[PDB]
Amino acid sequence: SMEQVAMELRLTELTRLLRSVLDQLQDKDPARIFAQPVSLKEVPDYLDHIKHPMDFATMRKRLEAQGYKNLHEFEEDFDLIIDNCMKYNARDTVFYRAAVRLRDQGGVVLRQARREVDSIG
Hints:
The structure is a monomer. By secondary structure, the protein is mostly helical. The chain has a single domain (about 1-120), classed as Bromodomain-like (Histone Acetyltransferase, Chain A). About 70% of the residues lie in helices and about 0% in strands. The longest helix is centred in the last third of the chain and has 27 residues, at about 95-120. The relative contact order is 0.16. This is Bromodomain-containing protein 1.
């Protein structure tokens, strides 16, 4: 149908905007602490602690398969990155501190992304 195509064009455009959001958020992690999944070879007990692991590479695979239907789903995944880190790592660690800084800096980006998603529809 023509409606299915119109819907697919909107998804494609949301995908374009989320890719730009993803790039901007990932720049706020210049240490690349959150770039890849936590290694289960190197942290064998990780899944005993964290039930839903997340990282920027995993978000990028989902993104490129157009697997985010809306900004809320994308934010859920970004929040998992931060929140998992802040539970697994103590307050005095470079990892925890990196998550706090990512959260604080990403807030600004996400605030305008919401306005754009609503605005462009």
